[PDB]
Design a protein around this ligand. Structure first.
Ligand SMILES: [Zn+2]
Ligand SMILES: [Zn+2]
Lengths: 157, 133, 277, 55, 55
């Protein structure tokens, strides 16, 4: 089924929105979150989920490169259509961590995924039109900052 | 007078040139519009002396320029295109009013309220507002 | 229903494509250069344009540029399809090198819709923003979708649902994904000292920049622009003396602005010597 | 003779420059009512920004 | 992310690789990978004078 996700007859976002493809990579994401190997480190994400469920943290942190090794095209789809991919990765992380920490939904309703160590970096003068609707990493200085207020509730800034 | 002068100029071209067989350098003049502007009216009573009974009567004044607005384009011809069949009309202005067609003029296309105004294909005339002291 | 065939524009497009295909071959090379580096704009030199059809093609394009502009876009989209489908699967035109430069006082309503080049010292610049170029909408009564909704200087919603099974009108949802946006910037330029007689006031004018031309205007620069004259909706003309035209009632006041498709700033011996006869 | 050649050369400077001048009028000028005073101010402003300006 | 198949230059790839490796990767490191498997990557040089690699 993973190879079938490579074979695409539509646009990148169009293929993902298909319910069969969405459930296909949902299973593929679910498989990886518990199955990984780092030689001596072995399944580091098993410990990552362990300490995250220990803290009941809402911040679901993932390293970018690790996903691209076990699941080659799964990480690249995440990069090209981050909104569509993270939408279901919210549910997959919820169900995968509930394999280790069930009844997590009893207290927290959602699991927003925090990507880390994304390799491609852009400056504020390099944001081309082609970079729209894509995951980007930029660096700068905090000039203006607003307060904390709830949004239609959850915090917003 | 202006219409008379325009006709007089047309008559002058017809009578004094081609009827006189002098030349024929008047072909385009039949179409172009003229205007004659009276300037040397007798000395007038100035701005502060004007009265309501003087309305619409030509007068004379002197003064100083203070403010000048840029060249405002005033509409003279409107360009309409049908939003479903792309037919183009040419509606002129009659006494400062624009008549928007309610239906497409083509026999085949009779959709009501199907016409649209294209701003940049219209024809405009130069208007300048000047302030005199 | 067969639409009206604008025979004048189609003849322009045929000549415009033939100009691209035949003129010596930088224009073919330019498209390939765009493909390599993912470029979005093609520049055309007007002196090259005047060298075909004994200048008649250039004059016709120059005098009614706003009318023929879609036909030139259709002309190039065929060519990029023909010789660079990658670019087609990924678009602006910019003219320059006009032989005459018109001063700010030459901006008159008789030239609306024609191509002209002006010179004027820049006084202000505004921050760039994206401008809606070609939008798309989805129906409300049904789930139909409307694409390729050109705006043409106003917020134009579709006038009909394309499906006969739906009767929706004047209700739409704006799409933020399939729609395309373009960079846009406003520049205030001022007449030069050498343009006006001594002791006289200098004029001012507002110029519009789109696409790659943005951020090329720097305050204090003696920039030169190339583009066409347009009219934008204006409400400041109300209250002025004189009889005001009306449409039916709606008011239709206008003010003149300039749309520039090209920006250059003008202030080594071998470079200098090559530009002189 | 040297002064004569100075005169001869300088007119050729204007005699050849006129080639790039009839493109100025041909391009965006549209009627006869244009007077020489208005045209002269236009010509100098078109060549003012070039490397070889004209008075 | 590229609309064309032209590979990006090495001077962009290596900084991106180095951050992922938590260790700086230099030009000579690429030649080690090429020695092990000759058909691993295309190694055509860019006309700009910058090394490139591609699948
Ligand atoms: Zn119609
Ligand atoms: Zn509908």
């Amino acid at each position: 089924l993973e190879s079938l996700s490579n074979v695409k007859a539509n646009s990148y976002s169009e293929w993902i929105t298909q319910p069969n493809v969405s459930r296909t990579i949902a299973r593929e994401l679910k498989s990886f979150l518990l199955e990984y190997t780092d030689e001596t480190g072995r399944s580091v994400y098993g410990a990552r989920i362990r300490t995250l469920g220990e803290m009941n943290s809402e911040s679901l942190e993932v390293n970018y490169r690790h996903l691209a090794e076990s699941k080659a095209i799964l990480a690249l789809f995440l990069a090209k259509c981050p909104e569509e991919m993270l939408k279901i990765f919210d549910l997959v992380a919820m169900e995968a961590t509930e394999l280790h920490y069930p009844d997590y939904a009893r207290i927290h309703s959602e699991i927003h995924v925090r990507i880390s160590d994304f390799p491609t970096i852009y400056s504020l003068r390099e944001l081309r039109e082609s970079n729209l609707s894509s995951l980007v990493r930029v660096t700068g200085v905090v000039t203006r900052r607003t307060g904390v207020f709830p949004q239609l509730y959850r915090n917003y800034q | 007078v202006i219409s008379i002068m325009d006709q007089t100029i047309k008559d002058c071209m017809v009578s004094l040139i081609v009827d006189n067989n002098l030349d024929y350098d008047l072909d385009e003049i039949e179409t172009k519009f003229y205007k004659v502007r009276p300037y040397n009216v007798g000395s007038c009573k100035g701005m502060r002396e004007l009265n309501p009974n003087d309305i619409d009567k030509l007068i004379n004044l002197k003064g100083l320029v203070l403010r000048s607005t840029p060249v405002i384009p005033d509409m003279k011809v409107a360009f309409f295109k049908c939003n479903v069949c792309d037919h183009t009309m040419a509606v002129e202005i009659d006494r400062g009013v624009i008549q928007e067609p309610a239906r497409c003029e083509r026999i085949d296309c009779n959709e009501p309220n199907s016409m649209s105004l294209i701003h940049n294909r219209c024809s405009f005339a130069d208007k300048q507002v000047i302030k005199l002291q | 229903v067969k639409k009206v065939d604008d025979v004048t524009g189609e003849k322009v497009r045929e000549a415009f494509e033939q100009f691209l295909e035949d003129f010596s071959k930088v224009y073919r090379a330019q498209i390939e250069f765009m493909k390599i580096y993912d470029l979005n704009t093609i520049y055309i030199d007007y002196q090259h344009l005047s060298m075909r059809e004994n200048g008649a093609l250039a004059m016709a394009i120059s005098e009614q540029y706003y009318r023929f502009l879609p036909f030139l876009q259709k002309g190039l989209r065929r060519v990029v399809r023909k010789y660079a489908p990658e670019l087609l699967n990924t678009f602006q035109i910019s003219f320059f090198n006009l032989p005459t430069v018109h001063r700010i006082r030459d901006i008159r309503s008789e030239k609306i819709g024609s191509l002209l080049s002006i010179s004027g010292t820049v006084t202000r610049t505004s921050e760039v923003r994206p401008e809606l170029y070609k939008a798309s909408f989805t129906c409300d009564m049904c789930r139909a979708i409307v694409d390729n909704v050109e705006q043409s200087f106003k917020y134009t919603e579709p006038t009909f649902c394309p499906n006969p099974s739906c009767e929706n009108r004047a209700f739409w949802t704006l799409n933020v994904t399939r729609s395309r946006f373009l960079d846009w910037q406003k520049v205030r330029i001022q007449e030069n000292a050498n343009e006006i007689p001594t002791g006289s006031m200098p004029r001012t004018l507002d110029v519009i920049l789109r696409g790659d031309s943005v951020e090329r205007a720097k305050p204090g620069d003696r920039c030169k622009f190339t583009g066409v004259e347009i009219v934008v909706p204006d409400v400041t003309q109300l209250g002025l003396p004189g009889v005001k035209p009306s449409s039916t009632v709606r008011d239709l006041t206008y003010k003149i602005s300039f749309l520039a498709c090209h920006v250059i700033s003008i202030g080594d011996q071998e470079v200098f010597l090559n530009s002189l006869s | 003779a040297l002064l004569s050649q100075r005169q001869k050369r300088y007119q050729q400077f204007l005699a050849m420059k006129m080639t790039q001048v009839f493109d100025i009028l041909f391009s965006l000028t549209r009627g006869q009512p244009y007077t020489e005073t208005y045209l002269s101010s236009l010509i100098v402003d078109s060549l003012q920004d070039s490397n070889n300006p004209i008075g | 992310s590229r609309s064309t198949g032209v590979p990006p230059e090495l001077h962009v790839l290596l900084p991106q690789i180095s951050s992922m490796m938590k260790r700086k990767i230099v030009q000579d490191d690429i030649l080690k990978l090429l020695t092990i498997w000759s058909d691993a990557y295309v190694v055509e040089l860019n006309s700009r004078g910058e090394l490139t690699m591609n699948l």
